[PDB]
């Protein structure tokens, strides 16, 4: 599917996400990961002068989603700050889920237990879709 | 993180330096002081503060009526860029120049070496809710919580200062600012 | 409703009172007269009418050039709120202050005890289609069909009046008004 | 799924819609019911001061859908006025469909017969999905 | 096209004449010259050009300050329509009348029989990036690539001319123009 | 499903697309064919006075998609100019796919070979969905 470059990530590892996971990007309007992928794709094709990021920022970034996350932050509700995304990855198969946002409260990342139900169902959902094919 | 016997919880963290190096960005030192940077390598910045003291009076200073560029001294080396960043801030605030109070800026013969743009957000100076409108815009722009707090004089002040790494670049603030200025030109 | 042997057609009706109690709302008495209410408990309202008679003349009355707040008497108790609601109406009309005709409002020494804001929508006063633009905005805002009707003088008039329950709150009109004023402050 | 409070409805009954029905909300962009649910959720979390409805009204309410309904109303075409929504409910099982809008012409609710084909297929659609699981 | 033994690749081409006959449209003769047409049957059009020669000087010609309609002679038969199309162009350019340079238009006693509206896009006249902002708007509006090219004087000029079928209607340009002027009135 | 009138097309043939193909229009946000179809439907109901195209242009045409195509054109990348759309059509059955845009570079339509991989998978996708029902 899409394999991100070294400069897009801080872990210094080759991360590539399959087309099966990334196909959900069009279906989901509340994915901040897909928005960040769109920014990185646009900047990637821009790097390889005039910069056209101001014209494409509405097409790449959902204003409503950013606004919702900002309002969640203003009310101390867990919010996405567009930096860290978690996904579930089947170690043996290599199949994974669409990376969801890692929420923040009080200027600190939400602990894994604090969204355990979020990554249980997702894991289960993966283990279900694998059996559908 | 081991979710189960054959499933693992993994994460990725993005690095947004290359995407937002050359675009205007903003940062929040505290809930009253904010900084706007034209680009990462700029030696100057614009400070946006919520203050309780009047610094410019209508009796001695100029009011901004379609002549914002005059608030910057003609001898400043980055005069055009500073006026551009002021317009970016103004469009990010969603300022209504027909209805919102007229901003004040310093006199031409000011002794102080900084350009000041003052907006009176005291209750009753503008229409109902103007102060709340501006404070909620500050919350949306810089992530501030100034609005979620308790009739004294209050102003929104924009001054120019030297960039001294007062904060770290925040690409969410960059996205908010760029969304407010969609279609403009940024990136040299 | 019995669709089949084991299936039923059921309905739910929403109550939007609590959501839109404290926000500006509007209502249509008829296709020419409309009312804008700042909040449910307001004792005053703004009447928006399409009239065939000139009430303010350019030879004797003030024109609104970034000084709308001056159209309200300084002794009115809800002066700031009324100016705010006027700005909400103006932004809801999608008024272009650079190109659209300059609104008129009453003289300072008017004997009548109401604040009048007049917009000349007669054909030829403004650019082509300005009357049609305003009438279609009235249709979008208040659900009016005034636009779908057949060169005489015509004006859009906004006056202030006492709230006398001239209509019932309409949350669709509230949504249209709030969408036109997104980011402003409403709800006390 | 989501169970609405008493003050949100005029019938004075406990109405709750399952997650299976409400999962279609993200998929459908022409649902006014989902928009009204978003408004009620935002107002619910607001009730439990500053009101942030002006900042979130674009994220909660689709401007295009409201505009389409207003234009339909101006042309006397049946339109949604965001007040009454109909759904199909299997009486024995309790499974139901996503509530669709109850259209209005001439300041009067559309009669059930006048959209019979609308609530036949939907009913049938429900009776099909039930057999898929 | 035969994809396989039982599958064929077929195409459809749309005809957008009927949808966009009666609405404003635009066309690009070359990367510097553009034409805006009020409707298909209009005998007049507006030419938008990027020029290197000054045609209007601030010392002898009028500047547009909320009085654009005065730039058209009162004896022109389609005066209102021409002013309307000028406003459509201005809104399509996303012009910022608070911050962008003040447009110039010809003197009242001009000998030339055409209405000229000039915008100075030379570097340093406006804020930083104003020239780039305008050139990228020209690219978005008319599909021009003028922006993707290499301090001399440069202006954006809008004049009026006779329609001589200088181009063919382009419904993508029509969509861009109408999107920039959503909510206005078009179609007679 | 939807059968287009003679004046909407230049080929002077009766073209009608089934509801199975057109059902994908709501799901896909990057379909220019669906936007053009919405435009034609609005103009059709308008023809059969005041013109309300300025109020409905945002609901019918996606601004982000038009902007993306314009930015693609400005950078000489293949883009959609909203004129010609290709689809895959099973000759015997008559089942077809949702018409995708025919891209343009250098003021010339992209040759069929130049997007062969685009109309192979689509064809295959059709031949797969046919077997699912
Ligand atoms: C942006 O542009 C605006 C105008 O659009 C400028 O504001 C004007 O500033 C000038 C000078 O900077 C002011 O002119 C002064 O006016 C006084 C009388 O003005 C009366 O009317 C205005 C209403 O327009 C009232 O605000 C004011 O209170 C008065 O009732 C004079 O007293 C002044 O005289 C000065 O100059 C003469 C020489 O000409 C000297 O002899 C005097 O000693 C004295 O120095 C002067 O003429 C003008 O009033 C301002 N207009 C408005 C509407 O505020 C902004 O300065 C400008 N801003 C920037 C940043 O460029
Ligand atoms: C924040 O913004 C403010 C204003 O917007 C800037 O402050 C101005 O900075 C400029 C420099 O960029 C200053 O201009 C310089 O001032 C010097 C002294 O000014 C005196 O000028 C005469 C001299 O008698 C008197 O009016 C009075 O005494 C002043 O104090 C001059 O030496 C400079 O001129 C030199 O350079 C120019 C240009 O190269 C040459 O033409 C001259 O010959 C000469 O060599 C120059 O004029 C200006 O004074 C400052 N403003 C104020 C109000 O004091 C800040 O710099 C800016 N900060 C940031 C970080 O952006
Ligand atoms: C919002 O602000 C605008 C200005 O931005 C105000 O409009 C001005 O209103 C004042 C008074 O209310 C007007 O001043 C009068 O001007 C007359 C001559 O004006 C000439 O030029 C203007 C162009 O600017 C033409 O419209 C006009 O026809 C003339 O050609 C004078 O005759 C008047 O004299 C009055 O005052 C003197 C004392 O100073 C008395 O002796 C006289 O008897 C008489 O009362 C006066 O000076 C001004 O013309 C208006 N400007 C414009 C552009 O319209 C609005 O009133 C204001 N609105 C609100 C709601 O506050
Ligand atoms: C719709 O909007 C209009 C205007 O925008 C409002 O009408 C104004 O209402 C105010 C009250 O809110 C009126 O102001 C009051 O007027 C009284 C009489 O006015 C006379 O004033 C002097 C007296 O000689 C003369 O010019 C002339 O005779 C006037 O008729 C005064 O008695 C009031 O003053 C009292 O109260 C003030 C404030 O508390 C005290 O300071 C005073 O000492 C005194 O006790 C006051 O000035 C005003 O006149 C009205 N406008 C007009 C043009 O007539 C409507 O009320 C408003 N309606 C709604 C529903 O919003
Ligand atoms: C849109 O509206 C604007 C105003 O909002 C018009 O611009 C004005 O144009 C008039 C005339 O067309 C100008 O008036 C002239 O002003 C001169 C002095 O002006 C001083 O101040 C202005 C600042 O406002 C400076 O720009 C200028 O350089 C000066 O410092 C006078 O010299 C002129 O005198 C003329 O008339 C007298 C008779 O009254 C004759 O005796 C003279 O010979 C001469 O002909 C004149 O008064 C005014 O300055 C302009 N204002 C601005 C802000 O630019 C636009 O013309 C108008 N555009 C359209 C398309 O309608
Ligand atoms: C592009 O836009 C420009 C201006 O915006 C238009 O040019 C103007 O066109 C009008 C006609 O539409 C011209 O007005 C006509 O001018 C004739 C001659 O003008 C002279 O007027 C007096 C006569 O001494 C002097 O100032 C001087 O010599 C002028 O040259 C007149 O004959 C016309 O009047 C006739 O018609 C009117 C109206 O029906 C009657 O009232 C009269 O009695 C008479 O019969 C008329 O005034 C105008 O001159 C042009 N402008 C300029 C600056 O020259 C373009 O036409 C327009 N093009 C397009 C395609 O839109
Ligand atoms: C910013 O806006 C505030 C709010 O309007 C302005 O302060 C206000 O100024 C007025 C006079 O200009 C004061 O009115 C005076 O009040 C006293 C009563 O204490 C009375 O003695 C005077 O006759 C007059 O009525 C008003 O009180 C004052 N408000 C506050 C809260 O102090 C302020 O001037 C504006 N500043 C700028 C720079 O624009
Ligand atoms: C459009 O904007 C341009 C850019 O500002 C204007 O041209 C500029 O005009 C100024 C004077 O008005 C010139 O400054 C002069 O420069 C010379 C040095 O060569 C010097 O002799 C003078 O004392 C003065 O400083 C400036 O050079 C010039 N810029 C260019 C690129 O030529 C132009 O006038 C504007 N035109 C209109 C119609 O608005
Ligand atoms: C997203 O939130 C996290 C905190 O949960 C931020 O990460 C911190 O970044 C700062 C520098 O800005 C470091 O000093 C901290 O050590 C980081 N904390 C952790 C836990 O990693 C991150 O910067 C935020 N991003 C945005 C765009 O707001
Ligand atoms: C939606 O339309 C219905 C009519 O079909 C409106 O219901 C009426 O509401 C008024 C009060 O506003 C009552 O007097 C009528 O008796 C109601 N009629 C019916 C048939 O129930 C409803 O108010 C409309 N809602 C909006 C927001 O426009
Ligand atoms: C698009 O389809 C049209 C038919 O609607 C194709 O045009 C036909 O092509 C065949 C084969 O070359 C000719 O025999 C016919 O005379 C053509 N008819 C018309 C009306 O043009 C056309 O080739 C296709 N366009 C493509 C694939 O770009
Ligand atoms: C879309 O692009 C095609 C070219 O690929 C354009 O088709 C041309 O149209 C012009 C007239 O505008 C004709 O002279 C050419 O012969 C056509 N070429 C082909 C290959 O058909 C089409 O006009 C473009 N449409 C838009 C809206 O830009
Ligand atoms: C938020 O988190 C910080 C970080 O430790 C903590 O000190 C603080 O008490 C928390 N709550 C609030 C309301 O700030
Ligand atoms: C964060 O959550 C983890 C769960 O993995 C837990 O071990 C850790 O103690 C938590 N940290 C704090 C500070 O509570
Ligand atoms: C609309 O409905 C009303 C309500 O009875 C009816 O009187 C009227 O004739 C209908 N038609 C029109 C065009 O108003
Ligand atoms: C409304 O439709 C119902 C169908 O349930 C029918 O019984 C009733 O007569 C209709 N009402 C009118 C006024 O036609
Ligand atoms: C674009 O296509 C034209 C049409 O033949 C061709 O002449 C030209 O070389 C191509 N490339 C560029 C960069 O213009
Ligand atoms: C266009 O592509 C077709 C493939 O069907 C090929 O036959 C033809 O030669 C191509 N045209 C050009 C000019 O390369």
Q: What one-character-per-residue DSSP string does B99-160 give? A: TSPPPEE--TT-SSSS-EEEEE-STTTSSTTHHHHHHHHHHHHH---TTS------EEEEEE
Q: F26-48 b/e with 16+ CB inside 10 Å = b?
A: eeeeebbbbbbbbbbebbeebee
Nearest to E47 by CA among E73, E82, E20, E15: E82
Ligand nearest to the CA of B152: 7
Angle between helices A63-74 and D53-60 (to 10 degrees): 140
Contact call for residues A8 and A40 (beta carbons, < 8 A): yes
Beta bridge partners of A109: A104
Q: Which residue of E has its CA nearest to C147?
A: E185
User: How far is the C-alpha of A132 from the C-alpha of A129, rounded, in Å?
Assistant: 5
Ligand 5 center from residue E111 Cα (angstroms): 20
CB E36 within 8 A of CB E28: no
- Closest residue of chain D to A63, computed from CA coordinates: D59
Contact B114, B157 (CB under 8 A): no
Distances (CA, A) of E159 to B79, C100, E23, E60: 32, 21, 20, 18
Note the helical H segments in chain D.
Answer: 19-22, 24-27, 32-47, 53-60, 63-74, 116-132
* Integer CA distances (angstroms), A53 to B24, B187, C125, E61, F51, in order: 12, 9, 41, 37, 35
Domain membership flag for residue C48: yes
The tokens for B31 are 């809930």
* CA atoms within a 13 Å half-sphere pointing along the CA-CB vector of E160: 23
CA distances from B99 to B55, C58, E100, E121 (A): 23, 22, 19, 29
Interatomic CA distance for residues D44 and C19, integer angstroms: 9
Query: For residues F43 and C135, what is the distance between their CA atoms, to the nearest angstrom?
Result: 21
Distance of CA A64 to the CA centre of its chain: 16
The DSSP output letter for F79 is: B
Of A22, A25, A27, nearest in space to A4 by CA: A22
Cα(A69)–Cα(F4) distance, integer angstroms: 43
Q: CA angle E17-D67-C84, nearest 5°? A: 125
Q: Is D116 in the pocket of ligand 16 (CB under 6 A)?
A: no
Q: Among all residues of chain F, which has the CA nearest to that of C132?
A: F50
CA distance B188 to B37: 14
What is the domain range of residue B164? Answer: 24-180
- Contact between residue C175 and residue D65 where contact means Cβ atoms under 8 Å apart: no
CA distance F114 to B130: 57
Nearest Cα neighbor of F8 from E169, E15, E174, E172 is E15
From residue E152, alpha-carbon distances to E133, E139, F79 in Å are 17, 20, 33
CA-based radius of gyration for chain B: 19
Q: Is the Cβ–Cβ distance between E162 and E47 less than 8 Å?
A: no
Work out how many domains chain E is built from and give that number.
Answer: 1
Backbone CA torsion sign across B167, B173, B175, B178: negative
Provide the greatest CA pair distance for chain D.
50
Residues of C in contact with D87 (CB under 8 A): 9-12
Nearest C-alpha neighbor of C102 from the set C120, C114, C90: C120
Question: What's the token pair of residue D40?
Answer: 């009620």
Q: Does residue A116's CB lie within 6 angstroms of at least one atom of ligand 14?
A: no
With contact defined as beta carbons under 8 Å apart, do C89 and C36 qualify?
yes
Residue B166 lies in a domain: yes
Q: For residue A112, report the distance from its CA to the centre of ligand 14, in Å.
A: 8
DSSP for chain E, written as a single string: -B-SSSEEEEEEEB--HHHHSSS-EEEESSSSEEEEESSTT-SEEEEEEEESS--S-TTTSEE-SS-GGGGS-TT-TTHHHHHHHHHHHHHHTT--TTTSPPPEE--TT-SSSS-EEEEE-STTTSSTTHHHHHHHHHHHHH---TTS------EEEEEEEE----S--BHHHHHHHHHHTTTS----
Task: Give this entry's resolution in angstroms.
Answer: 2.6
Counting one residue from D and one from F, how many pairs have CB atoms under 8 Å apart? Answer: 21
Identify whether B118 is part of a domain.
Answer: yes
Q: Is B144 a domain residue?
A: yes
Buried/exposed code over E162-173 (b: 16+ C-beta within 10 A; e: otherwise)? eeeebbebbbbb
Residue C54 lies in a domain: yes
Distances (CA, A) of F14 to E15, F22, F32, F96: 14, 17, 21, 15
Query: How many CB atoms lie under 10 A from the CB of residue B47?
Result: 17
CA distance A30 to A43: 22
Q: How many helices (H) and strands (E) does chain C have?
A: 4, 8
**Tokens at residue F46, please?**
């308008």
d(CA E162, CA C148) in angstroms, rounded, equals 33
Six-digit token string for E180: 């920039």
User: Of B142, B146, B136, B132, which Cα lies nearest the Cα of B51?
Assistant: B146
Q: Note whether C139 and F52 are within 8 A (CB).
A: no
Say if residues B93 and C184 touch (Cβ distance below 8 Å).
Answer: no
Query: Is E38 a member of any domain?
Result: yes
Let me know if C51 is exposed, middle or buried by CB neighbors in 10 A (0-12, 13-18, 19+).
middle
Q: Per-residue DSSP letters for A51-67? A: --HHHHHHHHS-HHHHH
- Residues of chain D with Cβ-Cβ distance to C19 below 8 Å are 39-40, 43, 53
Pairing mode, if any, of strands C33-37 and C44-51? antiparallel
Pocket perturbation via mutation, ligand 16, pick of D106, D111, D115 by most ligand atoms within 8 A of CB: D111
Among F75, F117, F121, F132, the strongest candidate for a mutation testing the A interface, having the largest count of A CBs within 10 A, is F75
CB atoms A67 and D58 under 8 Å: yes
DSSP B96: -
Q: Which two tokens stand for residue E99?
A: 């911050």
Q: Report the alpha-carbon distance of residue B47 to residue B81 in Å, rounded.
A: 15
Tell me, yes or no, whether B41 lies in a domain. Answer: yes
Identify how the structure was determined: cryo-EM
DSSP class per residue in A12-35: -S--EE-HHHHTHHHH-SS-HHHH
H helices within chain F, ranges in order? 19-22, 24-27, 32-47, 53-60, 63-74, 116-132
* CA–centroid distance for F9 within its chain: 12
Tokens of C134: 């305003």
Contact criterion met (CB below 8 Å) for E15 and F10: yes
């Amino acid at each position: 599917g899409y394999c991100l470059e070294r400069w897009m990530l801080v872990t210094s590892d080759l991360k590539c996400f399959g087309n099966t996971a990334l196909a959900k990007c069009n279906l989901d309007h509340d994915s901040e990961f897909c928005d960040m992928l769109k920014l990185f794709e646009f900047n990637k094709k821009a790097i390889e002068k005039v910069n056209l990021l101001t014209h494409s920022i509405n097409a790449l970034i959902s204003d409503n989603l950013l606004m919702k996350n900002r309002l969640k932050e203003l009310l101390n509700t867990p919010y996405c700050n567009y930096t860290k995304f978690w996904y579930v990855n089947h170690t043996a198969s290599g199949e994974h889920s669409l990376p969801r946002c890692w929420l923040v409260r009080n200027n600190s990342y939400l602990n894994e237990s604090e969204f355990r139900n979020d990554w249980i169902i997702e894991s289960d959902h993966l283990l279900s879709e694998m059996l559908n094919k | 993180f081991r979710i189960g016997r054959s499933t693992e919880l993994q994460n990725i963290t993005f690095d947004m330096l290359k995407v937002f190096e050359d675009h205007p960005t903003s940062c929040m030192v505290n809930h009253s002081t904010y900084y706007v940077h034209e680009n990462k390598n700029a030696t100057w910045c614009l400070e946006v503060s919520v203050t309780d003291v009047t610094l410019l009076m209508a009796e001695h200073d100029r009011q901004v009526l379609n002549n914002l560029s005059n608030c910057v001294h003609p001898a400043v080396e980055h005069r055009s860029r500073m006026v551009g960043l002021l317009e970016w801030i103004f469009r990010a605030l969603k300022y209504d120049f027909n209805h919102d109070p007229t901003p004040l800026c310093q006199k031409q013969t000011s002794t102080v070496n900084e350009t000041r743009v003052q907006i009176n957000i005291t209750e009753g100076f503008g229409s109902h809710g103007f102060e709340d409108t501006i404070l909620q815009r500050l919350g949306v722009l810089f992530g501030s919580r100034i609005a979620f707090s308790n009739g004294k004089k209050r102003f929104l002040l924009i001054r120019n200062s030297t960039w001294k790494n007062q904060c770290e670049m925040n690409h969410v603030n960059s996205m908010h600012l760029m969304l407010a200025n969609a279609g403009r030109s940024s990136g040299s």
